[PDB]
Amino acid sequence: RRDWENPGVTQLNRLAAHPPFASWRNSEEARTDRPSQQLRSLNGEWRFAWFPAPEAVPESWLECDLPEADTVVVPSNWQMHGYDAPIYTNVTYPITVNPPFVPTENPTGCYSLTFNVDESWLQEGQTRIIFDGVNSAFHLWCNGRWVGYGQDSRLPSEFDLSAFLRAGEN
Amino acid sequence: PNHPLWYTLCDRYGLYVVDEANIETHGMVPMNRLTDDPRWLPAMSERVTRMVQRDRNHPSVIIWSLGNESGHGANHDALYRWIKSVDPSRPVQYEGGGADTTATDIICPMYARVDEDQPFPAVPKWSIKKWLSLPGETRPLILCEYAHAMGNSLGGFAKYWQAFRQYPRLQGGFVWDWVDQSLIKYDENGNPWSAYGGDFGDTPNDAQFCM
Amino acid sequence: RRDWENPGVTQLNRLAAHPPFASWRNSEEARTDRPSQQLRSLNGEWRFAWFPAPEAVPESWLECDLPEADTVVVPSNWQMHGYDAPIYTNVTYPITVNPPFVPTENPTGCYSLTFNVDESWLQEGQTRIIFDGVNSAFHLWCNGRWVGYGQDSRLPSEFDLSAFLRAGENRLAVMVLRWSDGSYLEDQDMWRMSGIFRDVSLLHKPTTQISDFHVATRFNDDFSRAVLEAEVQMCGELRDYLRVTVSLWQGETQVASGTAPFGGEIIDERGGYADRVTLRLNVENPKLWSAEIPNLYRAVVELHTADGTLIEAEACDVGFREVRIENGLLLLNGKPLLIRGVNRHEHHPLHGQVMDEQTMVQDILLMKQNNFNAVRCSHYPNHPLWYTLCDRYGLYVVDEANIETHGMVPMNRLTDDPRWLPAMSERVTRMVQRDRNHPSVIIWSLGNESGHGANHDALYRWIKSVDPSRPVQYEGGGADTTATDIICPMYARVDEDQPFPAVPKWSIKKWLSLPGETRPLILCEYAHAMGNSLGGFAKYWQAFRQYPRLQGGFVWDWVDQSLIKYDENGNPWSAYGGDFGDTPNDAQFCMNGLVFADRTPHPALTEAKHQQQFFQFRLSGQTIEVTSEYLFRHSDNELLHWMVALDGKPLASGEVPLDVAPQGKQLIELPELPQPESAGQLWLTVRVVQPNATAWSEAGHISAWQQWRLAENLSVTLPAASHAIPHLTTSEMDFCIELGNKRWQFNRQSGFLSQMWIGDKKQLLTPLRDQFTRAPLDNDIGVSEATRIDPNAWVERWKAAGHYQAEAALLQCTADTLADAVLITTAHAWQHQGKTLFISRKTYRIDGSGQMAITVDVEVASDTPHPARIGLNCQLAQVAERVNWLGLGPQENYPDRLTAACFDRWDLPLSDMYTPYVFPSENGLRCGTRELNYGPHQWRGDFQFNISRYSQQQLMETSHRHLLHAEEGTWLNIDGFHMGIGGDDSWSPSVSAEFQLSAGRYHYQLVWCQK
């Protein structure tokens, strides 16, 4: 489908946008704007592997960690880690002007994370994942299953993971 | 749109914010080739609508912007109206296409000078004092960008403020800009230094214009 | 991917929308608009296979034909071929409301075609396929390879096949889905069908081509000068030698021409469009386009080299006209329009929603012949040929986007959702890109019944921005929202307010002057012509003519959406909702037209024609004043005929040519009319005749008429005295009167005339009895159903009050022998559960001349719902061929719908006295009748009447006209008074107070005798 070369597809399975949420289960904690146990940060050390194009990504990556990947901090821009060079151009586009196509050599960043979820979250309620910023487009998989797609590098993209999570590690 | 925490801090510390959609097609020829194309209206609409849905409750945000340097296209007019309809509490502005099009409640030119006219074809940058009184014009004028602080600059900054204070409808502007976009690199000795366009093998590039 | 359950995907690999192309390779062919060898039609016999779901389609189908599949004609709706049933539902969606999902069992239509393609088409250039209409979504394959996907059932979907075709034979595979996320935006009140219902064709364009072009026409203050501006876009390599020449023609005479290289003016900091060029041609004293005079020019757009080598040419008909709203008035070429419109669906009783030129032309001719000058495309872009016909014949068009979400709750749940903006935007933008060059289109509409959401405002502004030459309207959310330039309510009444919460329908007169309101008001829908309807139609036109800002409306609607079915004997009959096992359904609500599905006129059409006349008249003494309502044309093909008759007997006549300038007046002095000796009322009738045939009418066409009562000489002469005296005979059960060869029998137990003999031959099959009810009209029924009853509907009020159950109870019955006659006096009381509903007191006086004078005085309980009628009825034993009467006619007319009818002597076959409404009801009434003749019988007085082979009881119990059976003899219903039929809408009481029978006491008299 090459959803990244079609302005008609800016997302797949993405949840509706909304104001800042924390799903407090205590009115006093909501009033004081204190932390919410229903809102977890996944920031920290993730697994990363750089590729020159989406076609160079090995299918195995969906099921298990790539032994060649490195452990890096997220959030981050991989150019700041040295995987490829940041580009500074003012007006002229950093790529050939030929909408809606992009270079065949499309630097691809494969991120992954193994995490655990609270028991109660698997039996009741809705658990969603939120990416406040991904430059510039991405596909999401959870436990080997495709979840969704999202665009716009400056707004949060949210997806429902309720039907994908499982007991233990994900 | 910025990192969510930014609006929180602006709400609490006190700073008026112009929330701007992630839409810039400066490199197109003409500049509005995509924004006047209905095929691109969907992609553009999400960048505007989803921004409003996310930040409409922040008091610091007092003005919505349809984006930047994408000329003036019909998509802008459609989205200008969408915002006006869903959130009448905030004026909507946009500089593309002449800074005073039908898609902006505020004359918001970039680098328009105080007394000197710049009669560019189709998109002139009139002296700001002159702009306010053009036949039929009644809107306020706030430069979305002015006083380009590149290197040893800001000469003539005082001229703007004198005009701002004298003219009621000249209500200020936003200096360009806050911080140099220089990046750190290290030499053979491990000593850090400030780098700009081209210092990463990136080419073509625009060198020091990022600062 | 299931793209048919994702509003984020309305298409895949589909080409950009554009005006009608033909890619002529010869300028002369482009000018004359003759066929193009570069535009092939793939219409004809295709291969079709039906499946319950896309998952049931065999993968082998993509490669080769399925032997199971059949050979069917395309375009077509597969429901019309019997593969599955068409569903008729009004508001409630035909699928469960759970966007963007649709039923797992999704009827799938597998269309395929094996065709030839000449090498020349593949050697160079671009070859595209065009599907003008596919309901409602589809995937496309060419030679096994997937091409694209498309949604929106009412606009063309195009795909480039250049890389998929081969020289020689090729095969197309089209999987059409009945339901899709697009269905949520296609909830129009009509039959829900599916399939490739519009044309399919192949278009060959050169690599360097004209990809788009827009024509605009601006004028000076008095329209004596104009500038035609044509923007042209090209695709392919830009070259300094390329040129575009736009030439304008009036017949074979070139009036203007402009040539230029590509490269538009600077628009912003990055330059301008190097791939565009705008040509500007001056036109002095242009011939202006209007529905009155559809003057058209021909614009030929030539893409060529500087040296003159033609690459390709496109063209279109150009109509010079300016549409604008100024000071609250909608103006066309500077003049305020009066919209005599009608809503028109694309419907055919045999072919479904497949349109053909023959039917389109038939509709337009009938429309103009009945004084309509405008049509609304309810509620989606029409077949491309429609606009061409309107351009040429002359009809104002409201082009409407294919967007209706009526079934949602609230109605704007989707339209106010930004997630649905993309899908909505394409239905609007692609319509505009396609039809913007048609002069007949004067107003853009954002859709229908989808409430008012932010998406409407965004798209309203998009159109205002891209095409300021046409106003934009939309009725959703109250008819006067920020998304409409015209107050365009549906079914708002003339004087009565309907203060519904949030979306009130104010009286149209009151709406115009609400604080701060300044816009013109044109109803997008009014006068719901469902069944025996259009009562009160004249009230709208009187208001339209009196109020400058009330500029008309569009009647709902043109043609009944009935479908043909066949009985065991193979005989065809008209079917409506539920007749295909389709359920839930909304039965007969699919039939609201002025004409039957086969285009035969309903009686209401003539009332519309009369009220929509373009000439108004006034009489003063011997002077007739004719006022023209034409805005542009002079009455250059009109002759006024006048006739004066005494009770149907012509006494004088003449004709005078009309010579009236637009908006002007003409005085016609009638010659002194010789006072007739005979008694009676003199009537003056005038009619406007078109001596010459036109493109839309035959010579002799009558365009308008009007009647006036002139001098009346009341009869004061006494009838010759008879030398005979009726003889009374009495028995325990009867009162019998004898006179010559005539006998009358009154049953003393029932109190009614049970029989009449002429030469010992019975004249009655059923006794003469009072009748206060009528077989309910669709307007009497409203939305009341057997399960979901509406206590407010007239029929429910009559039922609950016992009007249909009420049985006559004899109170008095006496006979007195007088000097020259016998007098029978009676009194009856109709009661229900102890309540006296009506009381009827009569006297029957039979004299020596054989005449029977009947005097009736009725009392109606003030607290019982006003009765449908107050009269008598009986079943005559005889069945005669003709019905002759002196009164309003010749067509069916009711109290609130009789302005079109004229008083005169009419004579028609009995069958014409019955109106075949698909859903049977009271029908065929004729009002203001002073004399009725049937066989040897004659009735005189001042009454309303209908006469047919069907009893009110049968009509009342029969749901389809084809199930009716002629009863023995003839049923005669003679009314002293009859209730109005209503029609402002058909889902709430709409009969105005002045037409309700609320007087409490009524009086009428009849004289029955033998001719």
Ligand SMILES: CC(C)S[C@@H]1O[C@H](CO)[C@H](O)[C@H](O)[C@H]1O
């Ligand atoms: C290249 C200039 C003519 S356009 C100019 O460049 C500047 C660089 O700091 C800024 O980006 C301004 O916003 C932009 O208009």
Ligand SMILES: CC(C)S[C@@H]1O[C@H](CO)[C@H](O)[C@H](O)[C@H]1O
């Ligand atoms: C059924 C009414 C409450 S809605 C009413 O139904 C009519 C049926 O012909 C038409 O479709 C009107 O446009 C619609 O508003």
Ligand SMILES: CC(C)S[C@@H]1O[C@H](CO)[C@H](O)[C@H](O)[C@H]1O
């Ligand atoms: C009886 C007219 C309304 S028909 C009308 O007359 C016009 C000239 O006045 C033009 O000939 C139009 O084409 C024709 O339709």
Ligand SMILES: [Mg+2]
């Ligand atoms: Mg995309």
Ligand SMILES: [Mg+2]
């Ligand atoms: Mg879809």
Ligand SMILES: [Mg+2]
């Ligand atoms: Mg509807």
Ligand SMILES: [Mg+2]
């Ligand atoms: Mg002149």
Ligand SMILES: [Mg+2]
């Ligand atoms: Mg009259």
Ligand code: NA
């Ligand atoms: Na000021």
Ligand code: NA
């Ligand atoms: Na810069």
Ligand code: NA
């Ligand atoms: Na009027």
Ligand code: NA
């Ligand atoms: Na209907």
Ligand code: NA
């Ligand atoms: Na004439």
Ligand code: NA
């Ligand atoms: Na009936």
